[PDB]
Amino acid sequence: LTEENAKTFLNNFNQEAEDLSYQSSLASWNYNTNITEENAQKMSEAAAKWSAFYEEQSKTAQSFSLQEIQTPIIKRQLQALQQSGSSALSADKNKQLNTILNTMSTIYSTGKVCNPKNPQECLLLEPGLDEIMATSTDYNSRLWAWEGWRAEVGKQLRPLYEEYVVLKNEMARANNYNDYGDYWRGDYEAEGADGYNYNRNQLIEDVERTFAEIKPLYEHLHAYVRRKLMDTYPSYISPTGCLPAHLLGDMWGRFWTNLYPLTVPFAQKPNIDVTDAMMNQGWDAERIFQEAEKFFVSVGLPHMTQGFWANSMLTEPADGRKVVCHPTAWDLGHGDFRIKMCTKVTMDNFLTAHHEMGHIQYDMAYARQPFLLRNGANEGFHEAVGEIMSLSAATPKHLKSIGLLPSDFQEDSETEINFLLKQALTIVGTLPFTYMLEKWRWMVFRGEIPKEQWMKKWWEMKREIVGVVEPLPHDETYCDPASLFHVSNDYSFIRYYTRTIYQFQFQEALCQAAKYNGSLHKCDISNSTEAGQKLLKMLSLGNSEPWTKALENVVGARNMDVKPLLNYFQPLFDWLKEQNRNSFVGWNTEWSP
Amino acid sequence: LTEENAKTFLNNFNQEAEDLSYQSSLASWNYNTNITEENAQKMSEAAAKWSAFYEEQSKTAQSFSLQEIQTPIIKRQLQALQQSGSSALSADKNKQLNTILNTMSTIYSTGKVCNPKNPQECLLLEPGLDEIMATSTDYNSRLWAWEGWRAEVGKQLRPLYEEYVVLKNEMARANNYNDYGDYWRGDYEAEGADGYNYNRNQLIEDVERTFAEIKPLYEHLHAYVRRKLMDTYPSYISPTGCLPAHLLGDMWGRFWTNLYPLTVPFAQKPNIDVTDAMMNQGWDAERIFQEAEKFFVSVGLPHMTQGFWANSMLTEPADGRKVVCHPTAWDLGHGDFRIKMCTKVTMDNFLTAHHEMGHIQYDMAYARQPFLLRNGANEGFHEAVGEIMSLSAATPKHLKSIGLLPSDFQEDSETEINFLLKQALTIVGTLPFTYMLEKWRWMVFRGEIPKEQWMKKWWEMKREIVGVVEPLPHDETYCDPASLFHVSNDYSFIRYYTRTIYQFQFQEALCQAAKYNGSLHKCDISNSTEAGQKLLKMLSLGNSEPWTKALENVVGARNMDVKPLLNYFQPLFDWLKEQNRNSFVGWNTEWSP
Amino acid sequence: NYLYRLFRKSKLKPFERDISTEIYQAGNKPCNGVAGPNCYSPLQSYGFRPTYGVGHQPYRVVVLSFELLHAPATVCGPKKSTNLVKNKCVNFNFNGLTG
Ligand SMILES: *[C@@H]1O[C@H](CO)[C@@H](O[C@@H]2O[C@H](CO)[C@@H](O[C@@H]3O[C@H](CO)[C@@H](O)[C@H](O)[C@@H]3O)[C@H](O)[C@H]2NC(C)=O)[C@H](O)[C@H]1NC(C)=O
Numbered sequence A, B: 001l002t003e004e005n006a007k008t009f010l011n012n013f014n015q016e017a018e019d020l021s022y023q024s025s026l027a028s029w030n031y032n033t034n035i036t037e038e039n040a041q042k043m044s045e046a047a048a049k050w051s052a053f054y055e056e057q058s059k060t061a062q063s064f065s066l067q068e069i070q071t072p073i074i075k076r077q078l079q080a081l082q083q084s085g086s087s088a089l090s091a092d093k094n095k096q097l098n099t100i101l102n103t104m105s106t107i108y109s110t111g112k113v114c115n116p117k118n119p120q121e122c123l124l125l126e127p128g129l130d131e132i133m134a135t136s137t138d139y140n141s142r143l144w145a146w147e148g149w150r151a152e153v154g155k156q157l158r159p160l161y162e163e164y165v166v167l168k169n170e171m172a173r174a175n176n177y178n179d180y181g182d183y184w185r186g187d188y189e190a191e192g193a194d195g196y197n198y199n200r201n202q203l204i205e206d207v208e209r210t211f212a213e214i215k216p217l218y219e220h221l222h223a224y225v226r227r228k229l230m231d232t233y234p235s236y237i238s239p240t241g242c243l244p245a246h247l248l249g250d251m252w253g254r255f256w257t258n259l260y261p262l263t264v265p266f267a268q269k270p271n272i273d274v275t276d277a278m279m280n281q282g283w284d285a286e287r288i289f290q291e292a293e294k295f296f297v298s299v300g301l302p303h304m305t306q307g308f309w310a311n312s313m314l315t316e317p318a319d320g321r322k323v324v325c326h327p328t329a330w331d332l333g334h335g336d337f338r339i340k341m342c343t344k345v346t347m348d349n350f351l352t353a354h355h356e357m358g359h360i361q362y363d364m365a366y367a368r369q370p371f372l373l374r375n376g377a378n379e380g381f382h383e384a385v386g387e388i389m390s391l392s393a394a395t396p397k398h399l400k401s402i403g404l405l406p407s408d409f410q411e412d413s414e415t416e417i418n419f420l421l422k423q424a425l426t427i428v429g430t431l432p433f434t435y436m437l438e439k440w441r442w443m444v445f446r447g448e449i450p451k452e453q454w455m456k457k458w459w460e461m462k463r464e465i466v467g468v469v470e471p472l473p474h475d476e477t478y479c480d481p482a483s484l485f486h487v488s489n490d491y492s493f494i495r496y497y498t499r500t501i502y503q504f505q506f507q508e509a510l511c512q513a514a515k516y517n518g519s520l521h522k523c524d525i526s527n528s529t530e531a532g533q534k535l536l537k538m539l540s541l542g543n544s545e546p547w548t549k550a551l552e553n554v555v556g557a558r559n560m561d562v563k564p565l566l567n568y569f570q571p572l573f574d575w576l577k578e579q580n581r582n583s584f585v586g587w588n589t590e591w592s593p
Numbered sequence C: 001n002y003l004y005r006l007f008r009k010s011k012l013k014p015f016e017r018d019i020s021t022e023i024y025q026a027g028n029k030p031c032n033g034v035a036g037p038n039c040y041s042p043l044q045s046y047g048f049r050p051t052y053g054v055g056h057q058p059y060r061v062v063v064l065s066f067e068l069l070h071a072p073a074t075v076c077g078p079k080k081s082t083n084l085v086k087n088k089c090v091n092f093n094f095n096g097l098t099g
């Protein structure tokens, strides 16, 4: 029978796959920790063999018909295996798409904007332009950096995007998807028992529904930020107008976190930073991970493996091997879990360690599941589980409990307000940009936006949704979205929006589980074993079950809810309402200085 | 899971509901037996609490979705609970509809027609006009009573009906029904396993199909009644014409039972009445109920409860408490079964006692079932089960067996013929009136009949279906149907037609079960335990199963059949055919004097 | 004043009593200890009334459970005094001593 044949095929596949995947992951780890040409070539062969085996199994797997398979776990495993991805197209088309992707990656990596009338001062984005966006207060210098990078990247990348969209559309249609946007929205598709069914088309409306609720808080935040920037820039920002694109503290306006010194509520009150306390007590990276482990055992999740301590790098090696600065959590397979982080003794690294350990715990929980189902329920869940631990770690109660913060510390309202505003600038601010960018990409892939009117649509939506106006008029020869890293390198962007909703929903569910009686932002989930079990039920599942079922398992709801997000920011929202009474909340679409 | 949640919700509901329903039923019983202001107010509070609880549970029950419920009993219970009825409309519309219903009820109760040229002689329908319709032989007095009540009621009630139809249509549409007629036809809808499915639309065609078979017997009866009335009224009735509306022995022509002295086949032969025999032997109401109990135990149904004997009233109390004359069988709940009847020592009361005891036995059998399913399969079944016992009790074999009728009694053909004619006048005669009235109401609710042509349609159908002509022409300002009690007080009328079909079908099935070898009208089901079990299988079910399944359980058919009705009246039908040979059978639509 | 448990998570073991009044959670959402939709208080009331049918009238039940253990049995039925006859040859049973 077909189902038994599929079960035997999956049984053979899991044993062969786990070994090949471990070899590929180990080679990738060996390159990442010890960067060299030989480790890179070894990684290349390991990845090539693993990819070739995966495609060969996928081609055999496609012969099976899903109609006569009744058991959901086997059907889900076959669905995961049967995703051809880029292999659906012909060799010529696949090679052309790969060439376009590689040239886009190299051109973005090597992007150059240079000073007019000062030829020697030519700046790359990664070493210096980002520093200019984060720190510089000069209007003209920011205008130059934004316009120059926009002009060079957009003019070079506009044809490449024009054929990139067509090739992605062909690949998606070849894979029985309406457009590339539908292919991205497929990741959230869940097929399951009645009432757990989720559709790709549904996701857009769900995002819009969440956005409408988020919109008053964003509008109040935008008005407050606009007033503070107006204080910083006296005549270049209008009271009723949108914010200029180059004054948002980032190259693209993705994060508003760099506007915090300009937009601080209380300059006099210090931050909750505990780096100096770590310096005084002689803390090190090993202690940081041990404290994170203590938190995870205290909440009731299992202890870290011996292999994790033995094989991971938690410090810069300083023995002559090049390393990647970025913290990454690796699930190599066969019970091997590692973290690559160059940990300095700071509060931010401590939170990052909690986030990466959360990733490792998430990976560890679903190790029991079969190989194809050893993944997150969706892209958002994996980031969200780390983010909730990062939220819990940063609370003043947690810092006092572990002795980082003094026992006699007084928590006034003002520190809560400025901390919440910083969290909003990092977290709330990114959401309109994420929604607008994803909506633009989906409509471009769909063809709802006409080909020759792309720029004209995008700024309008930025005027409509983000409430940010262009500093200078841009015609259609520009490709203004393509300057972002995620779009130029073919990465989905809706995961951050889903991550943001899931993070607060999970945090409220755990706090209700832990019987916390106070404000959500002050909540700590330490020493609440029932909350750990409630979380662990979702963590064990992986993607074996529909993501709606996992969401119901933690929060009791089957869809995205932003009521926890509003609940988290409620004191800040009240404060923003209190201080915006004189001012006008909202923006006008037409360009105002 | 949804099904488990529904099961727990139903389990909580049954325990709360049974107690509240018992309190409401007990308060209603206390008012009915002991009429006073305080018992009425207590009944009002008990009904208010029960109704409020029922609506609150119904609103919670509507949240459940029936698609994911597989088990039929839980789905049927939820279906019964989810019927909002009149609560679907807004408060203003519901209040207006309630006001219209209350004013209609009070105006019908207080309806007044008064003698022209004799002002002092003003007559209500309930004390005296009905007596005039039953007994008076004068053509002019009957014409006055019919026309005067028709004029007063129709002129007052025509606007009230005009908005009543619209409000009922709004309520039915609010409950996902096409019209109010479909809402009434919903009661016969059965959803179940294949081949037991019954639809609302099907019912109309089924009624028409039954009617066509009934139509020759009705035509022969109409011709015989017309000839006898012609003997009574020499020049006012035409041989080929329809009967006058006011000569049918009733106010509306609903029952032809009052025409029996005029239309008696054999005046010389006495009736089968045994009242004098009861008087001679000193029988009382307690003995009448005991004999009924003896019949029920003999057929194999269970004995009456001790509570039934202790709490019921079977006699006029005569201690100063007002009572309702009408016999009613009460299922209070929690195994409490009572009968309120002011029983006089007569044959009619004896048959009525058998009918009410049949109702109590029907209520007792389905007590095992859950609270929402403790009802009849449909409206017709509950009346039919009592009616079959009434049919069996009245037979000469049953009267001889219990000593009411002498052992040496001779049953000649003539007594069978006159008794069958009386049964036909009560039972066969009502069927065209019932079908025509229900068809008119259904078409009016549907909108098939135009709003300004209502009266013109109704008389035509009475000419077409009933074969009864109006004495005087009526324009559209009249509302001639509304004079009837059931239509003015929002009561379904098709139940009598279904009751009539079911009663004969059940009687034939029990007689075949009991191996009776004679004519159906003479059949007695006494001392046939197998027939009692066959009946009891239907009685135990209640409405847990589709009514078609219960009908198959008793008669072996899944639909209404009038072949038992023809079989019951077959000697009478042969006699009517024998005596109508000279006369013309049938009526002419055009008005003939 | 007479109550019964209608809802419990698991069946009772023999000779076990549960006095908990905790709200029975039939649904995924936490009850939070306040009655709410899909959350029902376990203990229901037996609303006894004199006019109820025989099936539903209150009945008092006493269950007698007899157990034997390795310890000497100290609950036994009544001992018959009978009567004492003297000066004749009679079979005597005095406190379990026979002759
Ligand atoms: C979660 O549970 C652990 C264990 O119960 C908590 O650690 C405990 O924290 C308290 C207060 O910070 C400690 O009490 C005091 O500790 C100091 C330093 O040793 C001592 O000088 C005092 O006399 C007093 O004992 C307690 O020792 C400590 N226990 C352990 C095993 O570390 C932790 O605070 C809890 N976290 C939360 C957020 O509730």
Ligand SMILES: *[C@@H]1O[C@H](CO)[C@@H](O[C@@H]2O[C@H](CO)[C@@H](O[C@@H]3O[C@H](CO)[C@@H](O)[C@H](O)[C@@H]3O)[C@H](O)[C@H]2NC(C)=O)[C@H](O)[C@H]1NC(C)=O
Pocket (backbone or CB within 6 Å): B298, B397, B398, B400, B401, B402, B524, B526, B527
């Ligand atoms: C159903 O069954 C019962 C019991 O088998 C029948 O009652 C019986 O009826 C017969 C004839 O009426 C009685 O026979 C005679 O009774 C009188 C008065 O006692 C006596 O003087 C005669 O010598 C003769 O015995 C019989 O006693 C009576 N039995 C009982 C227990 O009441 C009943 O007639 C049956 N009904 C039908 C419709 O078949």
Ligand SMILES: *[C@@H]1O[C@H](CO)[C@@H](O[C@@H]2O[C@H](CO)[C@@H](O)[C@H](O)[C@H]2NC(C)=O)[C@H](O)[C@H]1NC(C)=O
Pocket (backbone or CB within 6 Å): A034, A036, A038, A039, A321
């Ligand atoms: C970093 O990588 C280099 C090369 O990939 C490692 O050097 C190798 O060490 C093994 C074991 O002693 C030798 O067999 C190889 O011949 C060496 N390769 C070369 C090119 O000399 C080096 O050991 C790695 N360092 C760490 C800390 O893992």
Ligand SMILES: *[C@@H]1O[C@H](CO)[C@@H](O[C@@H]2O[C@H](CO)[C@@H](O)[C@H](O)[C@H]2NC(C)=O)[C@H](O)[C@H]1NC(C)=O
Pocket (backbone or CB within 6 Å): B034, B036, B038, B039, B321
């Ligand atoms: C009929 O009803 C009245 C009142 O509804 C009953 O009278 C009550 O009797 C009880 C007990 O004897 C007294 O406690 C009340 O005070 C009485 N009320 C009044 C207004 O008199 C009467 O007993 C009932 N009769 C029957 C036969 O049930």
